[PDB]
Design a protein around this ligand. Structure first.
Ligand SMILES: Cc1cc2nc3c(=O)[nH]c(=O)nc-3n(C[C@H](O)[C@H](O)[C@H](O)COP(=O)(O)O)c2cc1C
Ligand SMILES: Cc1ccc(O)cc1
Ligand SMILES: Cc1ccc(O)cc1
Ligand SMILES: Cc1ccc(O)cc1
Ligand SMILES: Cc1ccc(O)cc1
Ligand SMILES: Cc1ccc(O)cc1
Ligand SMILES: Cc1ccc(O)cc1
Length: 347
């Protein structure tokens, strides 16, 4: 039985979720070429509004954030208007939705923004090329200056202000999976020797500046953050990264966020440097609402939540395979298994 998944969950004084099930953020690359959400995306999200909370696909904050084709933005008026169609439709169906705000950092590709500079904490190139694209080889990033950093914080904040007009309930800051914010938090990507590098305090500075700037625009109750304390998504591991997160997590607790959300693919994996699973590490170092994710079934998520391992469950691949995920779980019905072939269709 997975009855506890259907518990009402009060995130805070501003937001109460009708159940504990989140739709995980899932990049689909189906926006129009000007990165405006389509009416097909409106339908896609609307039919998943039985989720207690939808986290949108990663949504870019400005042009040099783009690393994959046709990923939506939220920096133009047209993009804002497209998103407002999405959020209105979700709300009309009794749902709630946060936008996931993205900058890909060194994982951006200049093909998408007219040959400009790829930006990152340090000039450390990742291996390879953009998935499902013809020969878009990753390039050496420019190490951002302090002025670049100030502009990036400004642009995260502006994107968050835009979320109000776009009608979202809030923002999940994409601090995970080796993208820009996560690049500051890990030693592979952050080799800086200024006030943004070296020490746990310095390496956490960019993340906390973005969190605080966004809180200043939309409030702590409407602000969540995804993190990846481990590596292994466009990120080489480093035994020193854990102490960054040991510092960051209590600092985040001070902000009384809507939630912290782990960004991994299989939470059954034990990470050497975290002394165990990602969720158990975060749970040991962070005492507020926590969203677990990664290869959970409704049954294993329910048990984890009953065991106080985390509070909310994000479901990704099954939500692609099963738009009616929540109803099927509610009715104890068979779920279709996900396959990558499903990514070709937006349903
Ligand atoms: C096709 C695909 C796209 C994804 N896009 C995002 C994304 O935009 N932002 C994000 O933080 N995670 C992204 N993820 C990670 C998922 O949010 C989730 O953490 C992962 O799929 C594990 O959960 P699951 O086992 O329930 O699918 C993506 C995963 C997949 C498979
Ligand atoms: C779903 C997807 C994600 C990335 C990409 O480059 C292409 C397709
Ligand atoms: C002007 C300036 C400010 C900070 C810094 O780290 C370098 C230069
Ligand atoms: C993000 C947001 C949405 C509504 C609102 O009233 C304030 C902020
Ligand atoms: C394709 C993708 C995009 C973002 C992310 O965090 C994970 C996977
Ligand atoms: C009044 C208010 C409440 C929540 C919030 O995020 C912003 C403003
Ligand atoms: C990043 C990714 C994409 C597809 C997939 O099936 C797993 C992981």
């Amino acid at each position: 039985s997975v009855e506890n998944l259907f518990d009402t969950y009060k995130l805070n004084d501003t937001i109460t979720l009708k159940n504990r099930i989140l739709m995980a953020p899932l990049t689909r690359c189906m926006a129009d070429a000007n990165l405006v959400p389509t009416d097909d995306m409106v339908a896609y999200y609307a039919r998943r509004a039985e989720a207690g909370l939808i986290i949108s696909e990663a949504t870019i904050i400005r042009p040099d954030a783009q690393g994959y084709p046709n990923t939506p933005g939220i920096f133009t008026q047209a993009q804002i208007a497209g998103w407002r169609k999405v959020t209105d439709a979700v709300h009309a169906n009794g749902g709630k939705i946060f936008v996931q705000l993205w900058h890909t950092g060194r994982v951006a590709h200049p093909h998408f923004f007219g040959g400009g500079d790829v930006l990152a904490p340090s000039a450390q190139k990742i291996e390879g090329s953009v998935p499902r694209m013809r020969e878009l080889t990753y390039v050496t990033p420019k190490a951002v200056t302090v002025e670049d950093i100030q502009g990036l914080v400004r642009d995260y904040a502006k994107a968050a202000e835009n979320v109000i007009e776009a009608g979202f309930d809030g923002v999940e800051i994409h601090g995970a999976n080796g993208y820009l914010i996560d690049q500051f938090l890990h030693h592979d990507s952050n080799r800086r020797t200024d006030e943004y590098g070296g020490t746990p305090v310095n390496m956490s500075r960019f993340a906390l500046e973005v969190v605080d700037a966004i809180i200043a625009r939309i409030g702590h109750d409407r602000t969540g953050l995804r993190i990846s304390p481990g590596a292994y998504f466009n990120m080489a591991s480093d035994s020193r990264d854990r102490v960054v997160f040991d510092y960051l997590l209590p600092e985040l607790e001070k902000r009384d966020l809507a939630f912290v959300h782990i960004g991994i693919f299989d939470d059954s994996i034990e990470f050497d440097y975290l002394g165990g699973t990602a969720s158990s590490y975060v749970r040991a170092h962070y005492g507020k609402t926590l969203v677990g994710v990664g290869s959970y079934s409704a049954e294993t998520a329910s048990k984890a939540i009953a065991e106080d391992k985390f509070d909310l469950i994000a479901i990704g691949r099954p939500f692609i395979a099963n738009p009616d995920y929540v109803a099927k779980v509610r009715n104890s019905e068979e779920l279709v298994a996900y396959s990558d072939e499903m990514l070709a269709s937006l349903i």
